[PDB]
Amino acid sequence: SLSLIAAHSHITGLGLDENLQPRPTSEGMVGQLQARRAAGVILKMVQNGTIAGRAVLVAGPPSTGKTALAMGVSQSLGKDVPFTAIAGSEIFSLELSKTEALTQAFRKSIGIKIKEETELIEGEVVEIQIDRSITGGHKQGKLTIKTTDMETIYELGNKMIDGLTKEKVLAGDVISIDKASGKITKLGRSFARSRDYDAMGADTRFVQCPEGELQKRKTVVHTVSLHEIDVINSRTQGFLALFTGDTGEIRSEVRDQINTKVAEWKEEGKAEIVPGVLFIDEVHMLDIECFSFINRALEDEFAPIVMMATNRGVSKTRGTNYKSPHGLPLDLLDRSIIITTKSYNEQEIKTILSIRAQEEEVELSSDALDLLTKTGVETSLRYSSNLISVAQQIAMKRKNNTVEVEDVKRAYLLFLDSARSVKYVQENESQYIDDQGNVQISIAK
C-alpha cells in the first residue's frame, strides 16, 4: 500500500507472442514494433544465460518510449533475477571512485542461487529443567515447548544452554529452533502473559502463540548478488555496510577469491549462477575514463547485459573537447548494437492517452480525448498526460464525474507549454534576469 500511480505504471511486461512478434496494443505497450522485437531478443539472451558481457544501446528522440521499454523488460524478466537501474549522475561520489562505483553496479546485477532446507520448531516455552554434573563441564536440559494443539519435550545440549542463556528466555516466550542447523531466535512474548508484568520494558514485544504442528518443513531459496559477498567478506561486521553504503573501495584480491570459489561452488553443485541486467539511463554524461572502464569491464565471465539509453545527437563527450555521436566514443560504439526508437502518430498518441486515463481512473468524453490528442500532436505527449490529471480535479470542482472539453480548455489556459512560456519570456525580456544579471524591477519608466 506504499505505491502511488507513477509515470508508467500501466506497463507490466513486453507484449510479445511466442514467436517474439509484437502485438499492436497488448500488456500496456502501444506501437514500437521493431524495438519491442529487439528487446524480446535481448530478453531471450538474458533468459538463456549462456552469454556474458553484452552492451546494447537504445537511441531515440525524447518522449519515445526508451525507459518504457526498459520498464517492460524489467517487468517481463520475472523475479529472483537482478535488475539494477542507475542514472549517469549517481556514479560521481565523494568517497568512492568512478571505477569502483561502476564495479559495484556491475556486481549488483549478477547473483547466485542457494537453496536450503529448514526444520523449524516454533512454540511457547513452558518449562526448562537444567541438570548440572559435578565437574560442570557439560550440562543436559529439558525443554517443554507448546503450541495451541500440541506440547512435547526435547533433550538439549551444552551449547543449546549456552545459546539459550544468551537472549534469556523465561518460560512463556515464543522461540523457534532449527533442528538441522541449530539456529535460535526469540520472537517475543505471548499475548496470554500480557497481563502479568504490568509494565512492558524496552526489549519486549508481544506476539501470538503459534498453532498447528510443532515441527514444520519448508524450503527457502536465497538469491545473493556478488557485491553482497564482496561487502560481507571485507570487514568483521559488513551487513551494516550493505545497509549504509560505507563499503569504501573493496580490494581486488577478495574479489578474485570470491570469483574463484563461486566457480568451485558451481562445479560442486551447491550454487547456480543467475545473470541479470544493468540499466544505465542517460549514459551521455559519463566521463571518458568511465567509458574506458566500461569497455574493458564487459570481457569478464561474471558480467551482466548492459542497456544504455541516450537522447543526444552528435554532441560533445564529457572529459574531452570533441563531438561524437550519442555523446559516446567510437570504441564504445564498436562494442554495441543499437535499438532505434521512432516518433508516434496521432492514433498511437490517442491510445497511450486513453491507457493513461484508464490507469489514473479518469473518465473522458470523445471530444475531450480528441482535443487532448490534438494537443499531444502539437505539443509533446507528457503535457496531455498531465492535463488529464489536472482537468479531472477541475471537473470534480464543478460537481461533475466525467471530464469535458471545458475542463481541458481551462487546464490549457491555466497551465502553459514550453513554447508559450518561451514566447511570453521572449516578448517581456526586461522583467527577467538575463545572462548578464540585468533586470528592470520597477513598473514606471
Binding site: 542457494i114 536450503e116 545459546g163 544468551k166 537472549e167 542447523s181 541449530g182 539456529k183 535460535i184 531466535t185 526469540k186 520472537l187 517475543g188 524496552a202 526489549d203 514485544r205 506476539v207 527457502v220 536465497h222 545473493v224 553482497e228 559477498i229 560481507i232 567478506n233 561486521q237 551487513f239 551494516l240 545497509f243 584480491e253 577478495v254 577469491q257 570470491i258 570459489k261
Partner: protein, 211 residues
C-alpha cells in the same frame, strides 16, 4: 585545572580535577528536551524509531534476518538487532569470538590465514619471520632504551557543564565521565582480588569484567 587544594591515621587523596571554563545551562532545556515527562514524547518516539520500525526486528522482518544469517553465519537471528542498537565502544569491549557454522557465505582470506598461523609461532620459522617485520625493526634499532623528546605544554580536562539545582545532571555527567565498563576495560584487576573472587567467592573466569 581547578581542583581541591590545601591552604596551609591516614589521609584521603580523592580525584577532584576540573576545568576552569564552565558552560551554564538552564534547567528548562534539560527538563523539556532530554528528560521524559508527561508533556513530551521522547520515550515514545525513541521506541517507535528504534524497536517498532527497526528492520532487523524478527517479529516483523524474519526473512531479512534469515537471509542475513545465511550470509554471515551467525547462529542467532537476534544478533543484528543487538548489533544495530548498541554503541561502538561497548561493541568493541564485549566482543567474543564465538563459533560460526561452516555452511555460510563468509570466508577466510589469505591475509587472515597468514595472520592466524603466526599468532603463537616461535622464531626461526620462515612464515613467522616473514610476518614479523615490525618487531625485528623494533629490536634492531634499540627502541626500548630511547628517550622521550616531546611533552605537551598544557594539559586540560573536559569542559565542565553545570546546571544549577539538579541532581540528575550530576549523576548523568558522573556516569558518562566515569563509565565503569570502559574504565575497567582500560585498567586491570589486582591479583589478590582475582584470587578472592575466583576461589573465595566462586566467580568463574568467564564472568570477570573485561580488563
Amino acid at each position: 585545572t581547578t581542583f581541591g587544594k590545601t591552604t596551609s591515621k591516614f589521609t584521603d587523596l580523592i580525584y577532584s580535577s576540573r576545568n576552569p571554563i564552565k558552560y551554564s545551562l538552564p534547567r528548562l532545556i534539560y527538563e523539556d528536551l532530554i528528560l521524559p515527562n508527561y508533556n513530551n514524547d521522547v520515550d515514545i518516539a525513541n521506541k517507535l524509531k528504534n524497536v517498532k520500525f527497526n528492520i532487523f526486528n524478527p517479529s516483523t522482518n524474519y526473512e531479512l534476518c534469515l537471509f542475513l544469517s545465511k550470509l554471515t553465519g551467525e547462529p542467532s537471528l537476534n544478533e543484528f538487532f543487538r548489533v544495530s542498537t548498541t554503541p561502538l565502544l561497548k561493541r568493541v569491549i564485549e566482543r567474543t569470538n564465538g563459533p560460526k557454522n561452516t555452511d555460510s557465505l563468509s570466508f577466510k582470506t589469505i591475509t587472515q590465514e597468514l595472520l592466524e598461523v603466526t599468532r603463537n609461532a616461535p622464531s626461526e620459522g620462515v612464515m613467522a619471520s616473514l610476518l614479523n617485520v615490525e618487531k625485528h625493526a623494533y629490536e634492531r634499532e634499540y627502541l626500548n632504551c630511547i628517550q622521550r623528546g616531546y611533552h605537551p605544554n598544557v594539559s586540560a580536562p573536559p569542559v565542565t557543564i553545570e546546571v544549577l539545582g539538579s541532581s540528575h545532571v550530576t549523576n548523568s555527567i558522573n556516569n558518562e565521565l566515569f563509565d565503569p565498563l570502559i574504565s575497567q576495560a582500560l585498567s586491570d584487576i589486582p591479583a589478590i582480588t582475582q584470587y578472592n573472587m575466583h576461589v573465595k567467592k566462586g566467580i568463574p573466569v568467564e564472568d570477570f569484567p573485561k580488563t
